[PDB]
Design a protein around this motif. Sequence first.
Motif, PDB file in Angstrom:
ATOM      1  N   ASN A   9       0.836  -1.217   0.000  1.00 56.30           N
ATOM      2  CA  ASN A   9       0.000   0.000   0.000  1.00 56.30           C
ATOM      3  C   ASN A   9       0.871   1.267   0.000  1.00 56.30           C
ATOM      4  OD1 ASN A   9      -2.591  -1.452   0.232  1.00 56.30           O
ATOM      5  ND2 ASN A   9      -2.041  -1.802   2.415  1.00 56.30           N
ATOM      6  N   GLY A  62      -9.479  -5.950  -1.075  1.00 55.74           N
ATOM      7  CA  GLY A  62     -10.207  -5.084  -1.988  1.00 55.74           C
ATOM      8  C   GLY A  62     -11.674  -5.014  -1.593  1.00 55.74           C
ATOM      9  N   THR A  63     -12.267  -3.804  -1.568  1.00 58.20           N
ATOM     10  CA  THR A  63     -13.715  -3.612  -1.310  1.00 58.20           C
ATOM     11  C   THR A  63     -14.495  -4.539  -2.242  1.00 58.20           C
ATOM     12  OG1 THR A  63     -13.762  -1.667  -2.785  1.00 58.20           O
ATOM     13  CG2 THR A  63     -13.625  -1.197  -0.461  1.00 58.20           C
ATOM     14  N   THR A  64     -14.061  -4.727  -3.481  1.00 61.82           N
ATOM     15  CA  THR A  64     -14.865  -5.521  -4.444  1.00 61.82           C
ATOM     16  C   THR A  64     -14.669  -7.023  -4.223  1.00 61.82           C
ATOM     17  OG1 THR A  64     -13.270  -5.711  -6.207  1.00 61.82           O
ATOM     18  CG2 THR A  64     -14.601  -3.704  -6.134  1.00 61.82           C
ATOM     19  N   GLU A 115      -9.918   4.825  -1.936  1.00 61.30           N
ATOM     20  CA  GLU A 115      -9.263   5.420  -3.103  1.00 61.30           C
ATOM     21  C   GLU A 115     -10.358   5.649  -4.133  1.00 61.30           C
ATOM     22  OE1 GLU A 115      -8.182   1.912  -6.087  1.00 61.30           O
ATOM     23  OE2 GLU A 115      -8.390   4.119  -6.211  1.00 61.30           O
ATOM     24  N   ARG A 117     -10.668   7.465  -8.489  1.00 65.80           N
ATOM     25  CA  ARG A 117      -9.887   7.732  -9.709  1.00 65.80           C
ATOM     26  C   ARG A 117     -10.248   9.114 -10.253  1.00 65.80           C
ATOM     27  NH1 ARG A 117      -7.902   2.428 -10.731  1.00 65.80           N
ATOM     28  NH2 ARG A 117      -7.772   1.471  -8.626  1.00 65.80           N
ATOM     29  N   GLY A 294     -11.028   1.082  -2.608  1.00 61.53           N
ATOM     30  CA  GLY A 294     -10.192   0.885  -1.436  1.00 61.53           C
ATOM     31  C   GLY A 294     -10.159  -0.549  -0.962  1.00 61.53           C
ATOM     32  N   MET A 331      -3.385   7.543   0.496  1.00 61.22           N
ATOM     33  CA  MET A 331      -4.812   7.190   0.280  1.00 61.22           C
ATOM     34  C   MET A 331      -5.715   8.171   1.067  1.00 61.22           C
ATOM     35  SD  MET A 331      -4.676   4.416  -1.704  1.00 61.22           S
ATOM     36  CE  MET A 331      -3.508   3.091  -1.970  1.00 61.22           C
TER      37      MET A 331
HETATM   38  O1  LIG Z   1      -9.755  -5.101  -7.977  1.00 63.25           O
HETATM   39  C1  LIG Z   1      -9.287  -5.280  -6.667  1.00 63.25           C
HETATM   40  C2  LIG Z   1      -9.287  -3.999  -5.859  1.00 63.25           C
HETATM   41  O2  LIG Z   1      -8.477  -3.122  -6.598  1.00 63.25           O
HETATM   42  C3  LIG Z   1      -8.074  -1.955  -5.884  1.00 63.25           C
HETATM   43  O3  LIG Z   1      -7.255  -1.141  -6.710  1.00 63.25           O
HETATM   44  C4  LIG Z   1      -5.847  -1.347  -6.608  1.00 63.25           C
HETATM   45  C5  LIG Z   1      -5.073  -0.024  -6.484  1.00 63.25           C
HETATM   46  O4  LIG Z   1      -5.424   0.570  -5.236  1.00 63.25           O
HETATM   47  C6  LIG Z   1      -3.576  -0.320  -6.523  1.00 63.25           C
HETATM   48  O5  LIG Z   1      -2.790   0.862  -6.477  1.00 63.25           O
HETATM   49  C7  LIG Z   1      -1.437   0.677  -6.040  1.00 63.25           C
HETATM   50  C8  LIG Z   1      -1.292   1.463  -4.753  1.00 63.25           C
HETATM   51  O6  LIG Z   1      -2.213   0.881  -3.847  1.00 63.25           O
HETATM   52  C9  LIG Z   1       0.127   1.371  -4.234  1.00 63.25           C
HETATM   53  O7  LIG Z   1       0.371   2.137  -3.057  1.00 63.25           O
HETATM   54  O8  LIG Z   1       0.965   1.910  -5.238  1.00 63.25           O
HETATM   55  C10 LIG Z   1       1.010   1.054  -6.383  1.00 63.25           C
HETATM   56  C11 LIG Z   1       2.217   1.467  -7.228  1.00 63.25           C
HETATM   57  O9  LIG Z   1       3.092   2.344  -6.469  1.00 63.25           O
HETATM   58  C12 LIG Z   1      -0.374   1.143  -7.044  1.00 63.25           C
HETATM   59  O10 LIG Z   1      -0.490   0.339  -8.213  1.00 63.25           O
HETATM   60  O11 LIG Z   1      -3.268  -1.045  -7.724  1.00 63.25           O
HETATM   61  C13 LIG Z   1      -3.861  -2.328  -7.708  1.00 63.25           C
HETATM   62  C14 LIG Z   1      -3.186  -3.124  -8.832  1.00 63.25           C
HETATM   63  O12 LIG Z   1      -3.583  -2.488 -10.040  1.00 63.25           O
HETATM   64  C15 LIG Z   1      -5.389  -2.170  -7.792  1.00 63.25           C
HETATM   65  O13 LIG Z   1      -6.060  -3.435  -7.673  1.00 63.25           O
HETATM   66  C16 LIG Z   1      -9.347  -1.201  -5.549  1.00 63.25           C
HETATM   67  O14 LIG Z   1      -9.058  -0.006  -4.834  1.00 63.25           O
HETATM   68  C17 LIG Z   1     -10.326  -2.069  -4.766  1.00 63.25           C
HETATM   69  O15 LIG Z   1     -11.470  -1.225  -4.654  1.00 63.25           O
HETATM   70  C18 LIG Z   1     -10.621  -3.339  -5.569  1.00 63.25           C
HETATM   71  O16 LIG Z   1     -11.487  -4.199  -4.840  1.00 63.25           O
END
Ligand SMILES: OC[C@H]1O[C@@H](O[C@@H]2[C@@H](O)[C@H](O[C@@H]3[C@@H](O)[C@H](O)O[C@H](CO)[C@H]3O)O[C@H](CO)[C@H]2O)[C@H](O)[C@@H](O)[C@@H]1O
Length: 413
Positions: A9, A62-64, A115, A117, A294, A331
């Motif tokens: 994170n 993940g919330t989803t 989070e 977009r 989130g 976040m």
């Molecule tokens: O689909 C599953 C889940 O996805 C979540 O989205 C995430 C992004 O929050 C995440 O972003 C990363 C950051 O969290 C982190 O600190 O930095 C990296 C790079 O420095 C970022 O990529 O990326 C991941 C992978 O693409 C996504 O899955 C949703 O927020 C959540 O709602 C959902 O259930």
Amino acid sequence: TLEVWIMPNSPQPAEDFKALVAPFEKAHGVEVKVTVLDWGVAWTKITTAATSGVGPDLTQLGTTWVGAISAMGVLEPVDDVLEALGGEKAYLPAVWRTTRLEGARQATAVPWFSELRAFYYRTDALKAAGVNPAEMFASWQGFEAGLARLKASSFRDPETKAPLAPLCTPGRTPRTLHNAAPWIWGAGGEIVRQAGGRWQSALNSPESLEGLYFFLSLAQKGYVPAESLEKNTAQIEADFQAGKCAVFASGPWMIQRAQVPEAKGGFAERTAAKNLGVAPYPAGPKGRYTFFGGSNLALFNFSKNKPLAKELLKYLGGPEAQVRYAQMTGMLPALRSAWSDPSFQQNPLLRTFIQAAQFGRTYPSLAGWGGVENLAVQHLGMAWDLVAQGRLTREALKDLMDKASAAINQALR
Ligand SMILES: OC[C@H]1O[C@@H](O[C@@H]2[C@@H](O)[C@H](O[C@@H]3[C@@H](O)[C@H](O)O[C@H](CO)[C@H]3O)O[C@H](CO)[C@H]2O)[C@H](O)[C@@H](O)[C@@H]1O
Ligand SMILES: [Cl-]
């Protein structure tokens, strides 16, 4: 010893997590051991723990994902924790709805962080193109005319000494509809809809196809370079950082990354970091939406450390931990009260994410959500491949979302 599984994170996530929990450890005379799972793999390891009964006390979700894990029957009720944190009142409804499987009696996850977009922009590229951001990000039409002005512009990043792509978006088979959802919603569409006691695909509704086609055709008109079509989210992130793109959609993390040296997992050094703007998704024909997500924390009902794991869930969900972890991750807190901290309010880029949250929209929290998003992204991957040929028409896109829809409706029956 308590075991927590988390995703990456923050740039050093295990170390940030451990600094976050040190005061809980001291007050409870207990050690927390953290394991960090990559987003690419975290699904499989969490599902394997749920299936095998072997795993941590707590896991980030993940919330989803909360619906599907809850439906496997392995999550401990946490209504008691959500009450100690202020109950339904303490949360945006968007957040509140992620605490349970849709329609289940008991909450099974505790909100951790939010989070959503929005578009990052190169203030320098837009100033040089003569694009007023207020106009470009007001409307779908203003967005399309700002990309056109960005395409015509002489501008060249001072590091790369080449043109910027107007828009960068990934064409690789996406993992999720996070990039695409705002365009489906803004047209008046949806991924699934509930009617007559059942959920069915709306991805082949004319509103959904309008939104999707509008998004995919930008790439087809020349506003997204062919190179972007061959890239995934992480590669597009890198491309914006390296000065190849004027505009792209991401979460709030990139603000804290832009204030961190390259050597620490950031790009503060790069032009893009010095010329950084944020704006909301443009309003579509049927209003303004962005994906709102989130991560929550869940407790496995085979945990031997339920009492302490619950104290840890109340600690992480509470105001002080909420502020502290949002500052290390970049976040937003899950907890409404924690948004009022000045650390969030007087950060002008983060303040734009905060305003965007008015129009945050979420997935319904369904047991089968995962299966739905997976057939949708498969078919959407085939659409991107037609865009890579100049051959996405309304007909071919409708044919693909009819097949997605027929395969989604089977999955839900
Ligand atoms: O689909 C599953 C889940 O996805 C979540 O989205 C995430 C992004 O929050 C995440 O972003 C990363 C950051 O969290 C982190 O600190 O930095 C990296 C790079 O420095 C970022 O990529 O990326 C991941 C992978 O693409 C996504 O899955 C949703 O927020 C959540 O709602 C959902 O259930
Ligand atoms: Cl996409």
